Design a protein around this motif. Structure first.
Motif, PDB file in Angstrom:
ATOM      1  N   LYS A  69       0.876  -1.169   0.000  1.00 33.32           N
ATOM      2  CA  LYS A  69       0.000   0.000   0.000  1.00 33.32           C
ATOM      3  C   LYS A  69       0.913   1.219   0.000  1.00 33.32           C
ATOM      4  O   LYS A  69       1.628   1.483   0.972  1.00 33.32           O
ATOM      5  CB  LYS A  69      -0.949  -0.027   1.211  1.00 33.32           C
ATOM      6  N   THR A  70       0.912   1.942  -1.115  1.00 32.26           N
ATOM      7  CA  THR A  70       1.870   3.026  -1.318  1.00 32.26           C
ATOM      8  C   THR A  70       1.360   4.361  -0.755  1.00 32.26           C
ATOM      9  O   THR A  70       0.519   4.375   0.143  1.00 32.26           O
ATOM     10  CB  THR A  70       2.351   3.113  -2.787  1.00 32.26           C
TER      11      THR A  70
ATOM     12  N   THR B 187      -2.233   0.481  -4.551  1.00 27.08           N
ATOM     13  CA  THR B 187      -1.513  -0.716  -4.143  1.00 27.08           C
ATOM     14  C   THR B 187      -0.735  -1.254  -5.342  1.00 27.08           C
ATOM     15  O   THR B 187      -1.230  -1.236  -6.476  1.00 27.08           O
ATOM     16  CB  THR B 187      -2.476  -1.798  -3.596  1.00 27.08           C
TER      17      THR B 187
ATOM     18  N   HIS C 290       3.063  -1.880   4.349  1.00 30.03           N
ATOM     19  CA  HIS C 290       2.615  -0.497   4.333  1.00 30.03           C
ATOM     20  C   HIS C 290       3.813   0.416   4.172  1.00 30.03           C
ATOM     21  O   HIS C 290       4.678   0.481   5.047  1.00 30.03           O
ATOM     22  CB  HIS C 290       1.782  -0.211   5.582  1.00 30.03           C
ATOM     23  N   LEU C 291       3.878   1.081   3.020  1.00 26.91           N
ATOM     24  CA  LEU C 291       5.004   1.946   2.708  1.00 26.91           C
ATOM     25  C   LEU C 291       4.797   3.331   3.281  1.00 26.91           C
ATOM     26  O   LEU C 291       3.773   3.970   3.028  1.00 26.91           O
ATOM     27  CB  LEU C 291       5.213   2.043   1.195  1.00 26.91           C
TER      28      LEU C 291
END
Ligand SMILES: [Zn+2]
Lengths: 338, 76
Positions: free
Chosen positions: B6-7, B12, B68-69
């Motif tokens: 998830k950017t 995503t 998670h980014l």
């Protein structure tokens, strides 16, 4: 007045102090320290990080036995956290959410009720209904990670991945200790916290270069992926993704995100036919600056008495609730309502 | 196997990885797609920030898990 001690800046350590004050005002975590209940949970044996829990708890104890205008040094605590997480050695500016994740990991590990983690092998749970699979995956997680820290912060996401060709929906359940939310870019009249939660939980289209492999179709297919919350935590930490996706130079996103003081109702994000939670705000970590540098403060509501204060290292000052919502808000700490 | 990231803005992305992939490997694959350098990336899974030198298997990250980014707001 109780719990209004400031924390000395040791050299760019307001990222740390901001988090520490948010944790100090996390009622049940505070109580765990004040009532010395961690002592029963500490692992036997010569452990390198026993002192991390002890110094954290001592700091909270000191804050809550202080008089207003007192300034406490967290230097002994810093020594312990940097031993656990060497990235915090020295006196450089750091990210508060990064610090939170390393600190809570260290605390959790040292008071884990599971003293010997079982290996566990992957299981085929296709025969189980979604909710039961969720419960079983949760049990498997708890048999490895079970602490007072988890009691407060841990929840469970459901990720539903549907193949648009065969219609199979593959579900996985990921634990979470906080949620990192993208910031809405198309909000009117304003950007709200709910808008950001919606960006997190929306249907994500996975096509082109992002096509997953469907095991049923035996090939790459357009799929739709969607998060829902299967289990809500007692304390919900929301982390706003205030950084651009520039491939050259990241910029801080300074967009005002309107978040509620009370009645954050997460009904629409709960998994289908699953009981949802409602929260009230009790703390905020604020960042003022750029991605490369700046200054942290915290706004915290004292448990029970309901008064808000600004914590800015040594300086602790009263504030009106009308002053709590600002564009500087970076981490939001929510607790279950009533 | 596939995992997801998830950017930063709502999207995503899908990565192809093996359980033996190092976190460095994963960050490189994210850079390939997103143009964010590994030294800027932080990846969160199950409350853990994933550390260079370790593998996906070390964290028991299985197929279709989501990382998670997040980047950084450095502050003093
Ligand atoms: Zn399919």
């Amino acid at each position: 007045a109780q719990g209004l001690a400031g924390l000395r800046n040791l050299g760019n350590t307001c990222f740390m102090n901001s988090i520490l004050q948010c944790l100090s005002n996390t009622r049940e975590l505070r109580d765990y320290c004040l009532q010395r209940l961690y002592m029963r949970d500490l692992h036997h044996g010569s452990n390198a990080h026993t002192a991390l829990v002890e110094e954290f708890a001592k700091l909270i104890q000191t804050i809550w036995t202080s008089s207003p205008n007192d300034v406490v040094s967290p230097s002994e605590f810093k020594t312990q956290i940097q031993r656990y997480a060497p990235r915090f050695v020295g006196y450089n500016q750091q990210d508060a959410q990064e610090f939170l994740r390393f600190l809570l990991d260290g605390l959790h590990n040292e008071v884990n009720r599971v003293t010997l983690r079982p290996k566990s092998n992957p299981e085929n749970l296709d025969h189980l209904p979604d909710d039961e699979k969720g419960r079983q995956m949760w049990r498997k997680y708890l048999e490895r990670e079970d602490s007072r820290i988890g009691d407060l912060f841990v929840g469970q996401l459901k990720s539903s991945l549907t193949c648009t060709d065969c219609g199979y929906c593959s579900t996985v359940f990921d634990p979470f200790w906080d949620l990192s939310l993208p910031i809405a870019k198309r909000g009117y009249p304003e950007v709200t916290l709910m808008d950001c939660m919606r960006l997190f939980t929306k249907e994500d289209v996975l096509d082109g270069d992002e096509k997953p492999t469907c095991c049923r179709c035996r090939g790459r297919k357009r799929c739709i992926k969607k998060f829902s919350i299967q289990r809500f935590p007692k304390i919900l930490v929301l982390h706003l993704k205030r950084f651009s996706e520039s491939r050259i130079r990241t910029s801080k996103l300074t967009t005002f995100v309107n978040f509620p003081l009370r009645d954050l109702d997460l009904r629409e994000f709960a998994s289908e036919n699953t009981n949802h939670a409602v929260y009230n705000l009790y703390a905020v970590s604020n960042h003022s600056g750029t991605t490369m540098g700046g200054h942290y403060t915290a706004y915290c509501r004292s448990p029970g008495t309901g008064e808000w204060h600004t914590f800015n290292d040594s300086s602790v000052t009263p504030m009106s609730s009308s002053q709590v919502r600002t564009s500087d808000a970076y981490l939001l700490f929510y607790e279950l309502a009533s | 196997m596939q995992i997801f990231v998830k950017t930063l803005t709502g999207k995503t992305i899908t990565l192809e990885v093996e359980p033996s992939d190092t976190i460095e490997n994963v960050k490189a694959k994210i850079q390939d797609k997103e143009g964010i350098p590994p030294d800027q990336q932080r990846l969160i899974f199950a409350g853990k920030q994933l550390e260079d030198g370790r593998t996906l298997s070390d964290y028991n990250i299985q197929k279709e898990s989501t990382l998670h980014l997040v980047l950084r707001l450095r502050g003093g």
